[PDB]
């Protein structure tokens, strides 16, 4: 499923991402935009044999288990296939745990490169929330 910017912004607010651990809602929409282009079924195979899954490209080496990644840890205690749903519940749950680590949202490389230090609120502007 490919979300529209405002559609995801509204769903993410509904999933309590607005102001979760000091991050404004715009950070999450921008992040999803640059991590997966709002595509919930997006996947990317990495060099280390790990795969990033879902709307928020969650890594199979540290966060979810896809049964195919070497030094896997499954920090989110969930199967990677659960982050490929049109339902963003599992992806949001895991992302919240990821961000609760000291590195915060810096775990999302695309977010780092394209959102951090940018006017992130613009991503929820012009939306019926």
């Amino acid at each position: 499923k490919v979300f529209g910017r405002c559609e995801l912004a509204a769903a993410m607010k509904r999933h309590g991402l607005d102001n979760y651990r000091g991050y404004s809602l715009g950070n999450w929409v921008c992040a999803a935009k640059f991590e997966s282009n709002f595509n919930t079924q997006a996947t990317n195979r990495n060099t280390d044999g790990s795969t990033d899954y879902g709307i928020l490209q969650i890594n199979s080496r540290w966060w979810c288990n896809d049964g195919r990644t070497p030094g896997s840890r499954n920090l989110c205690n969930i199967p990677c296939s659960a982050l490929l749903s049109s339902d963003i519940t599992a992806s949001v749950n895991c992302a919240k745990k990821i961000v609760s680590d000291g590195n915060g949202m810096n775990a999302w490389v695309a977010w780092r490169n394209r959102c951090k230090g940018t006017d992130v609120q613009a991503w929820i502007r012009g939306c019926r929330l």
């Epitope: 309590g16 102001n19 651990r21 499954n74 920090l75 680590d101 000291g102």
Partner: antibody, heavy 113, light 107 residues
């Protein structure tokens, strides 16, 4: 499956340092976030803090920085150090993972002169 | 610090009836509100995750709802094993905080 268990002194004196160890059986401590929660004599629960997989920590400001949460990969345990305790720190301490799915049995620690 | 207020402090019910426990946040926390059950000489047990997400291994009679600052924990048809303490907790902002708790007793 995973199981947690608190251990350490149950009686300590004022101004000393209270230390508890949480032993984790079933999986590596490096595969989760770990925390410490305590219950005061009046059903008052307080989230003390947690240590992330990275070793980064979050401490409740209410502890005025007397708390320290560390871990030992080799022994597969994580600890809690609470400095300069007072009768105010008399409570039932529990260790549980960040998600709160796994909890220990809880151990009462009385601070007394 | 986000403050959680639970009402009522105590609730008396007859096994078989239904009850709803309230928890209000001094500030909005979206859906980041969790419910715990605690019985004497026992550590807390997670009943509901993020306002309304159910937990594997927990009776179906437990359900939660609400968002923002107003949340509720419902128990459709109370059972004897359901008597004990119930606490809500928010993870939206550090430090995580718990509500004072609501005690559920047999009528």
């Amino acid at each position: 499956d995973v199981q947690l268990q608190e251990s350490g002194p149950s009686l300590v004196k004022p101004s000393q340092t209270l230390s508890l160890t949480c032993s984790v059986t079933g999986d590596s401590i490096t595969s989760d976030y770990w925390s410490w929660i305590r219950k005061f004599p009046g059903n008052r629960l307080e989230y003390m803090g947690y240590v992330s997989y990275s070793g980064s920590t979050a401490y409740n400001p209410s502890l005025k920085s007397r708390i320290s949460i560390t871990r030992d990969t080799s022994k597969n345990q994580y600890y809690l150090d609470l400095n300069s305790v007072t009768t105010e720190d008399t409570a039932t301490y529990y260790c549980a993972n960040w998600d709160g799915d796994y909890w220990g049995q809880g151990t009462l620690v009385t601070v007394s002169a | 610090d986000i403050v959680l207020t639970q009402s009522p402090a105590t609730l008396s019910v007859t096994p078989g009836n239904s009850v709803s426990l309230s928890c209000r946040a001094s500030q909005s926390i979206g859906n980041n509100l969790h419910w715990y059950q605690q019985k004497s000489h026992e550590s807390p047990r997670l009943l509901i995750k993020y306002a309304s997400q159910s937990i594997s291994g927990i009776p179906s009679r437990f359900s939660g709802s609400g968002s923002g600052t107003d949340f509720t924990l419902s128990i459709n048809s109370v059972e004897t094993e359901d008597f004990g303490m119930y606490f809500c907790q928010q993870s939206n902002s550090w430090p995580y905080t718990f509500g004072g708790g609501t005690k559920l007793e047999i009528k």
